[PDB]
Amino acid sequence: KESEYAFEYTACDSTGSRWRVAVPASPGLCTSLPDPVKGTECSFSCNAGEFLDMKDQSCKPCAEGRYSLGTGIRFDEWDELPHGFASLSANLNCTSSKWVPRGDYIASNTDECTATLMYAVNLKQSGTVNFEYYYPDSSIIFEFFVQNDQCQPSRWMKTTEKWEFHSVELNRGNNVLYWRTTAFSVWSSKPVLVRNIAITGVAYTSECFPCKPGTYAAKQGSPFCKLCPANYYSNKGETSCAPCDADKYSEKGSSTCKVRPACTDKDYFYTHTACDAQGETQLMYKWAIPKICGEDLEGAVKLPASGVKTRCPPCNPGFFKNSTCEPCPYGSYSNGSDCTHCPAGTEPAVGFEYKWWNTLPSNMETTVLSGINFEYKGLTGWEVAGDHIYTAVGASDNDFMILTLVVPGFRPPQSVVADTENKEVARITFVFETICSVNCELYFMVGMNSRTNTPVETWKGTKGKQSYTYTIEENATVSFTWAFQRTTLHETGRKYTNDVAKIYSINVTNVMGGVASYCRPCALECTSCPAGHYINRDSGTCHLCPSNTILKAHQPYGAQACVPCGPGTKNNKIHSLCYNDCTFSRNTPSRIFNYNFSALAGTVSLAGVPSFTSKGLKYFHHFTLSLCGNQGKKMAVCTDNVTDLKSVTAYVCQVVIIPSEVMGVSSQPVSLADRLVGVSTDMTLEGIVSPVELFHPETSGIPDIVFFFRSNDVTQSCSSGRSTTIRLRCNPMKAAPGTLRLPSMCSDGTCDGCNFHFLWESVAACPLCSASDYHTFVSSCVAGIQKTTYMWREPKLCSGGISLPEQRVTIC
Ligand X SMILES: *[C@@H]1O[C@H](CO)[C@@H](O)[C@H](O)[C@H]1NC(C)=O
Ligand Y SMILES: *[C@@H]1O[C@H](CO)[C@@H](O[C@@H]2O[C@H](CO)[C@@H](O)[C@H](O)[C@H]2NC(C)=O)[C@H](O)[C@H]1NC(C)=O
Residues that bind ligand Y (CB under 6 A): 581-583, 596, 598, 605, 622, 639, 641, 660, 665-666
Asked if 51 and 207 count as a contact pair (C-beta separation under 8 A), the reply is yes
User: Nearest approach, Cβ of 42 to its own copies (angstroms)?
Assistant: 11
Q: Which is nearer to ligand Y, 235 or 639 (CB)?
A: 639
The upper half-sphere exposure of residue 728, i.e. CA atoms within 13 Å in the direction of its Cβ, equals: 28
Give Cα 125 distance to the centre of its chain.
Answer: 43
The residue from 230, 781, 802, 809 that contacts its own copies (CB under 8 A) is 781
Answer yes or no whether residue 317 interacts with ligand X by CB under 6 A: yes
Q: Strands 478-485 and 400-407, how do they pair?
A: antiparallel
x-or-dash string of contact with ligand X, 449-488, rule CB under 6 A: x-------------------------xxx-----------
* Spatial separation of the C-alpha atoms in residues 61 and 208, rounded to whole Å: 9
Asked if 762 and 735 count as a contact pair (C-beta separation under 8 A), the reply is yes
Q: Which is nearer to ligand Y, 637 or 718 (CB)?
A: 637
Asked if 123 and 169 count as a contact pair (C-beta separation under 8 A), the reply is no
The residue with its CB nearest to ligand X is: 409
Please identify, among the stretches 114-122, 564-572, 593-601, 721-729, the one whose residues bind its own copies according to the rule CB under 8 A: 114-122
Asked if 380 and 368 count as a contact pair (C-beta separation under 8 A), the reply is yes
In this structure, the chain runs to a length of 812
Kind plus residue range of the DSSP H or E element containing 129: strand 128-129
The residue from 63, 81, 118, 601 that contacts its own copies (CB under 8 A) is 118
Please identify, among the stretches 117-125, 239-247, 304-312, 426-434, the one whose residues bind its own copies according to the rule CB under 8 A: 117-125
* Spatial separation of the C-alpha atoms in residues 217 and 240, rounded to whole Å: 7
User: Nearest approach, Cβ of 759 to its own copies (angstroms)?
Assistant: 20
* Spatial separation of the C-alpha atoms in residues 303 and 305, rounded to whole Å: 6
| Sequence letter at residue 95 | T
The residue from 6, 30, 303, 512 that contacts ligand X (CB under 6 A) is 512
Q: Which is nearer to ligand X, 226 or 554 (CB)?
A: 554
Asked if 486 and 381 count as a contact pair (C-beta separation under 8 A), the reply is no
Q: Which is nearer to ligand Y, 332 or 583 (CB)?
A: 583
Site for ligand X in 393-452 (CB under 6 A): 408-409, 449
Asked if 310 and 281 count as a contact pair (C-beta separation under 8 A), the reply is yes
658 three-class SS: coil
User: Nearest approach, Cβ of 96 to ligand X (angstroms)?
Assistant: 6
User: Nearest approach, Cβ of 645 to ligand Y (angstroms)?
Assistant: 8
Q: From the list ligand Y, ligand X, its own copies, none, which binds 507 (C-beta under 5 to 8 Å, kind-based)? A: ligand X
The residue from 91, 110, 128, 174 that contacts its own copies (CB under 8 A) is 174
* Spatial separation of the C-alpha atoms in residues 22 and 19, rounded to whole Å: 10
Site for its own copies in 1-60 (CB under 8 A): 8-12, 19, 21, 23-24, 27-28, 31, 33, 35-38
Q: Which is nearer to its own copies, 745 or 782 (CB)?
A: 782
Q: From the list its own copies, ligand X, ligand Y, none, which binds 701 (C-beta under 5 to 8 Å, kind-based)? A: none
* Spatial separation of the C-alpha atoms in residues 778 and 808, rounded to whole Å: 9
Q: Which is nearer to ligand Y, 89 or 603 (CB)?
A: 603
Q: What is 676-744 written as a DSSP string?
A: EEEEESSSEETTEE--TTTSPPPSS-SPPEEEEEE-----SS-SS----EEEEEE-SSS-SS-EE---S
Q: From the list its own copies, ligand Y, ligand X, none, which binds 782 (C-beta under 5 to 8 Å, kind-based)? A: its own copies
Answer yes or no whether residue 777 interacts with its own copies by CB under 8 A: yes
User: Nearest approach, Cβ of 660 to ligand Y (angstroms)?
Assistant: 5
| Sequence letter at residue 70 | G
Asked if 627 and 597 count as a contact pair (C-beta separation under 8 A), the reply is yes
Q: Where are the beta strands (DSSP E) in 315-385?
A: 319-320, 326-327, 332-333, 340-341, 351-352, 364-369
Asked if 406 and 477 count as a contact pair (C-beta separation under 8 A), the reply is yes
User: Nearest approach, Cβ of 750 to ligand Y (angstroms)?
Assistant: 20
Question: What Å distances lie between residue 513 and 340, 406, 408, 520, 708, CA to CA?
Answer: 17, 13, 10, 16, 41
The residue from 130, 147, 159, 346 that contacts its own copies (CB under 8 A) is 147
| Beta bridge mates, 730 | 762
Answer yes or no whether residue 362 interacts with its own copies by CB under 8 A: no
* Spatial separation of the C-alpha atoms in residues 448 and 430, rounded to whole Å: 19
Q: From the list ligand X, its own copies, ligand Y, none, which binds 26 (C-beta under 5 to 8 Å, kind-based)? A: none
Answer yes or no whether residue 806 interacts with its own copies by CB under 8 A: no
* Spatial separation of the C-alpha atoms in residues 392 and 298, rounded to whole Å: 26
Answer yes or no whether residue 518 interacts with ligand X by CB under 6 A: yes
Q: Which is nearer to ligand Y, 478 or 665 (CB)?
A: 665
Q: Which is nearer to ligand X, 519 or 604 (CB)?
A: 519
Q: Under rule CB under 6 A, how many of the chain's residues touch ligand X?
A: 20
User: Nearest approach, Cβ of 86 to its own copies (angstroms)?
Assistant: 6
Site for ligand X in 87-146 (CB under 6 A): 93, 95-96
| Sequence letter at residue 225 | C
- From the list 294, 478, 500, the residue with the least C-alpha distance to 399 is 500
Question: What Å distances lie between residue 152 and 69, 148, 177, 796, CA to CA?
Answer: 30, 5, 12, 65
Answer yes or no whether residue 791 interacts with its own copies by CB under 8 A: yes
How does 431-444 read in b/e, with b if 16+ C-beta sit within 10 Å?
A: bbbbebeeebbbbb
Asked if 734 and 740 count as a contact pair (C-beta separation under 8 A), the reply is no
Please identify, among the stretches 95-103, 295-303, 431-439, 772-780, the one whose residues bind its own copies according to the rule CB under 8 A: 772-780
x-or-dash string of contact with its own copies, 303-332, rule CB under 8 A: ------------------------------
User: Measured between alpha carbons, how far apart are the two ends of the chain, in Å?
Assistant: 148
Instruction: List interacting residues with ligand X (CB under 6 A).
Output: 93, 95-96, 317, 349, 351-353, 408-409, 449, 475-477, 507, 509, 512, 514, 517-518
Instruction: List interacting residues with its own copies (CB under 8 A).
Output: 8-12, 19, 21, 23-24, 27-28, 31, 33, 35-38, 86, 88, 118, 120, 122, 147, 149-151, 173-174, 176, 733, 775, 777-782, 787, 789, 791-792, 794
